[PDB]
């Protein structure tokens, strides 16, 4: 035929996806390695190219810890991602499904975490490898940042929180917790 103009869309819905997305939404996008886990992205813009025609999506990349320069670390959550310097444009049909990037705080407040739920406490730099903020709060004797996956427990003099394994204690110890005092007290 002949081609229609390019148009920026309020929203786009895909039959394969079966879900309808708008700008500002977070999505999972198939990487070229299909076995590889989905890329997490934030949709800045949706646009249709009349030539194809096809739909292009301007995405800002959310990096996984294992995609970061530093690599994954102990205090890094399973569903943790960093908002990154990296922008790209992808096909609309590379989208598997919608997802939610919560604030670290709101993620902590979540009753149950599904494969859809993620959290972000770090902004990220793709070239340098810088983090913003450069540091957060730390806890226990390991003096490491908090991983919401893991279980900690509070006390009195310290009123700090501890990994049981870090102090001989059981995973099972704190259930039967009349209460907690730690040596530093």
């Amino acid at each position: 035929k002949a081609k229609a103009p390019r148009r920026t869309l309020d929203s786009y819905t895909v039959k394969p996806i079966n879900k309808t997305v708008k700008p500002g939404d977070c999505v999972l996008m198939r990487p070229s390695d299909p076995s590889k886990p989905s890329y997490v992205a934030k949709i800045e813009r949706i646009e249709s190219d009349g030539r194809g025609p096809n739909v292009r999506v301007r995405v800002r990349w959310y990096y996984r810890p294992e995609e970061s320069i530093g690599g994954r670390r102990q205090f890094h959550g399973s569903k943790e991602v960093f908002l990154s310097d990296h922008y790209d444009t992808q096909s609309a049909d590379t989208i598997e499904g919608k997802c939610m990037v919560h604030s670290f705080k709101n993620y902590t407040k979540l009753d149950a975490v599904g494969n859809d739920d993620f959290f972000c406490r770090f902004e990220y730099n793709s070239s340098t490898g810088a983090f913003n903020p450069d540091r957060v709060a730390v806890y226990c004797k390991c003096e490491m940042p908090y991983n919401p996956d893991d279980l900690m427990v509070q006390c009195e003099g310290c009123s700090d929180w501890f990994h049981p394994a870090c102090i001989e204690m059981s995973a099972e110890e704190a259930k039967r917790l009349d209460h907690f005092f730690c040596e530093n007290c």
């Binding site: 149950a112 919401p148 279980l151």
Partner: peptide, 8 residues
């Protein structure tokens, strides 16, 4: 105690 449990 602090934890967010993941189930689905």
């Amino acid at each position: 105690t602090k934890q967010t449990a993941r189930k689905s």
